[PDB]
Design a protein around this nucleic acid. Sequence first.
RNA 1: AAAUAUUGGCGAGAGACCGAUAGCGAACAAGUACAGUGAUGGAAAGAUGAAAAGAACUUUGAAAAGAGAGUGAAAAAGUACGUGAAAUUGUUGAAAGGGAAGGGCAUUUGAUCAGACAUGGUGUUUUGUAUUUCACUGGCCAGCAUCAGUUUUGGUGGCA
RNA 2: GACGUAAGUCAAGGAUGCUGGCAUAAUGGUUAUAUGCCGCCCGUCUUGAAACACGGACCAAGGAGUCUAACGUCUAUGCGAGUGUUUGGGUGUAAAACCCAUACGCGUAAUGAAAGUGAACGUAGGUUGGGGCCUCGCAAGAGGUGCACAAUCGACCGAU
RNA 3: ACUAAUCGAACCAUCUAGUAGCUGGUUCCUGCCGAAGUUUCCCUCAGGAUAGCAGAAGCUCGUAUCAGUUUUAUGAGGUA
RNA 4: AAGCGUGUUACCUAUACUCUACCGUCAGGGUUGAUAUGAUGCCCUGACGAGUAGGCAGGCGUGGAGGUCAGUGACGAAGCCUAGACCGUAAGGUCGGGUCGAACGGCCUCUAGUGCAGAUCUUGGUGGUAGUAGCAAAUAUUCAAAUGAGAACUUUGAAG
Lengths: 127, 167, 185, 148
Amino acid sequence: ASLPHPKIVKKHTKKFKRHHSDRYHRVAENWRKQKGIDSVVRRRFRGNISQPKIGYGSNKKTKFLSPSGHKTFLVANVKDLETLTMHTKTYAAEIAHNISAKNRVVILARAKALGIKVTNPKGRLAL
Amino acid sequence: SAQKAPKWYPSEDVAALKKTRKAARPQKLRASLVPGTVLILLAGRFRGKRVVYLKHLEDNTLLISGPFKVNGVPLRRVNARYVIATSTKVSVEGVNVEKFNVEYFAKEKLTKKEKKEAKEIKAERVEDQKVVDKALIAEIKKTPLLKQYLSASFSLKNGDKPHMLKF
Amino acid sequence: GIDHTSKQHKRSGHRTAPKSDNVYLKLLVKLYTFLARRTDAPFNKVVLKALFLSKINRPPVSVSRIARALKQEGAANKTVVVVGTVTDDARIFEFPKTTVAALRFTAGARAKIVKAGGECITLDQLAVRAPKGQNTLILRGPRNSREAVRHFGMGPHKGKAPRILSTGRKFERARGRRRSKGFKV
Amino acid sequence: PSRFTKTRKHRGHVSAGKGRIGKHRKHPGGRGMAGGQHHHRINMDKYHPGYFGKVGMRYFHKQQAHFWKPVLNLDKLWTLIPEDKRDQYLKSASKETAPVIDTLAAGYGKILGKGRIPNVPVIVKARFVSKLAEEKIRAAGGVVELIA
RNA sequence: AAAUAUUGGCGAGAGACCGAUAGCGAACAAGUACAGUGAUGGAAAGAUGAAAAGAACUUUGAAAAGAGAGUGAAAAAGUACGUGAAAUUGUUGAAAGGGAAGGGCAUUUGAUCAGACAUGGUGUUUUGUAUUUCACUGGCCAGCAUCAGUUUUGGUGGCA
RNA sequence: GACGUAAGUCAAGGAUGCUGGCAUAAUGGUUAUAUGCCGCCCGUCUUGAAACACGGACCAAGGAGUCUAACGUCUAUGCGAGUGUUUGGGUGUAAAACCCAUACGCGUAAUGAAAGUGAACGUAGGUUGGGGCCUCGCAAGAGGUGCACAAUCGACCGAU
RNA sequence: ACUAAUCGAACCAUCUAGUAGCUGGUUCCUGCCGAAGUUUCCCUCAGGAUAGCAGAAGCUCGUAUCAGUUUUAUGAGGUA
RNA sequence: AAGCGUGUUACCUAUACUCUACCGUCAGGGUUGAUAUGAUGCCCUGACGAGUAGGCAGGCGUGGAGGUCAGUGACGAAGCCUAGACCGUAAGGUCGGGUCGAACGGCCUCUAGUGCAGAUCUUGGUGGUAGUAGCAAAUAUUCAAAUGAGAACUUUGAAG
């Protein structure tokens, strides 16, 4: 299936929401460092949101690894896919969003015939 | 292309593990556990049942049977951590127990087809219990109130404290 | 927390690789990294370090400076190594027979050396024959002869040239430079 | 290009690398060389000594064509002869056929004496020569004859 | 005279330019509407659809319009028309609510969601020889044992 | 390294063995809620902001270290006592590209207000240190050479 | 006072994007280092220059010509 | 005493100390005679990690340009919504679902009108206040009929 990996420990799974992204609709959830002279979030007061730190960096052996244990690889056509012929134990293909539904059945035709896992085999089905 | 390529592909090889230096030493049982003592089962169907400890199986389990005529606990293996040893002891020198081993208790060989998608007793599992508890019960009857002791389950009546309690 | 006697995470302050993308320079660094690591010679470390140096820190070494070096007794047949360029020189007229190993060779220097029977090898053709730097001789051009250096450390009575673009009279020859007007620097 | 400017790195940081307290203003210190004698005096004495004053005379209507006098030292004297024939005159130093080096045609007005020409006679046509250069040409056996 | 200048006029060609709050003020009946006594100031406003094919007809309604039917590929394109965001609003559904609410750490509960391994599988006599009809594993979570590292808490032994 | 005569084994440069259950919302995730504790409203000026300091009703879009002339340090590149084609000419598939002469700029010489003069006594010097190299040296180390560079006394050139 | 709701110098357009040592704002993330409010001069005290503190680029070398330190010896001080 | 003075222990807990794992930075190293996807890589060892103004570095994103994937696309591009999922510490990217209708991506470079929460910011729009304040001067209206879907307000008539 996939090569053995150490058990995934994300070390921080809650997304870092920008401070006051809830309070103000103009402030988007995307993280921005609060560079204020007085902001409690910057000063790391107790009881305030955690800021992204390099400490939270995930294990190098398990970076960009899906919970299944594969590095997802965004694939467009059959030619892109057949580069995983000799990498199926690590890379799980992912059909690009813009691939038409007719072309998906041929992409999964090769992926099934090559034993390469596909992250989204159920997208743009015909039913 | 939707994504270019990884130039340093991970090696597909699965790494052989190191020669771990963890041998399987024999288990050193507690001083309180001696063949013939009475154990209060703590977990399982027969939790709280008084049983007799017969033999120390090689799989770290204890072959015990409060005689099936007494408390209805069959010859079974348990875990030495889920029992409480007790002062009282019976003499089981004359009961055949050496024929009971791990290969005797093996449940069944499970496959992917023989699955209980929706949903007896062996004649040898009955006869052996009989040829065991014959010696056990014959030994028990020479002391007062032991058979009633084994029949009667164990419970922590309120007020008592097991830390200051000894068995 | 600890008593940080010195700065933490202080970089060594030395170049570990060329700042350039010159692949052939990076091949010489690749080769001389191997030689510096795998040899006892302190020569290859100096060459490996010197390849990292920048353009101001790799000044041209004229053939005259090599010819001056070849006058050293016991250094007649020593191979000359210049981690930099070698520019020819018109001040001299005769060039002693030798071999010079350098990164770059100005066309004039190549002509002048080969007419003397010289062999303008490159630093790879160096390392082929003399991995440990046998009877080698490393030369360096005058670093503090750069014109940008005479303005360094300017101050009162430091004896340095001011940063002036339009040199001449009526440009920095007034009060503060002669006693008759104000003072003297 | 601008995608490498620190200004793109300063996005988000309030003061754009210019300080909260200082408050990058229009022209806090003046404009240009302003206050060179009053509040920039230390700068104009530490780094530009001799900036203020009137030294020297005034040459009305100076023409640099008059003061054109590029100087050729003796070490460079042998660069003017074309490289093709340079060796042919270095060897077999002939008193009866000496090379003529027309420094004026080569774009030099004066010959200086930085020294050590080889011992081969040369005829040097030049506008001016220093004392030492003249004595060094004679020492090598050549002559300097003046032109205009 | 030519070499020179040329943000005006006329014509022409181009663009690493802008792309409808940008680019001229003006992509449109723009120096227009409008304001000022006047000199002057001076906007906004692009896109249905391939084609109006711009909704015949039926019914309710005074009518607008609604509901049908109908055109159209689409009416989730109806001239209030490409797409149709947010603020804000309605409705429905879910949840909570003793002078705020919102957030952080952790978990409960509810709702909802991805992954395995359930592998060609350590094989097994092709109905005129590639479906191996009993498979090896670990996937998730635990228990015991023997260990190792850090530590904690004791009980005893010898000795100075 | 221990135990071992040795073979080997081992608690000796990091967890293996066995057993069980489930194989899916069970563990986990997201989200809502409850609870425990905590959490003042951001930006800014400030010694000091939750401030009874100021700005901020909300939302979308627009919105603020750019370009140039001349330079400085530094880095890269090309050539290198030179260097710079693109003022211009030839050419061209045509604002591209290609080729090119003479000049001119900067550099190769400085100093003086200027007239002017204008850099080898020496192996381009001596001393001290100096990477590296060479010799001897099992090896430290000792000698010779000693680039750059640092200091210093010189020597030469201009001015007085 | 009034001079078109404008008057201790109207209104309009332009020079004009007038100037401001003053106020406000100054837009992505992460990592590493990380201060100053002191010197001297200035019609200088809401500001500059200058040295200081800081970063970066490094460079010459490779355990030293070192040190917010002690000891020993030897000074110096005139506060308590 | 749950006060004051004092002493003996026991105990509680910081982001401090120790140990372990992981991330990152730094430093010191190893790694090329048919062995390695051929080295800014891989790996080993160790120490460190607070931070405003500020400095540097590595990255993410937007409009456009060169190249390339003989890339995606009307069998549905872009866009937009998504208490649906995945990756990344993060900037962000990816995928699924709905709407939509015609173009748009990945990577290597180039380029700039390149990133918004503020500026009593600009323009546009929309809120709470809020169905609120208000529609209160000029004495004053009323009845019936007419028309009309509909009459406090229209017509006429009669009073006032």
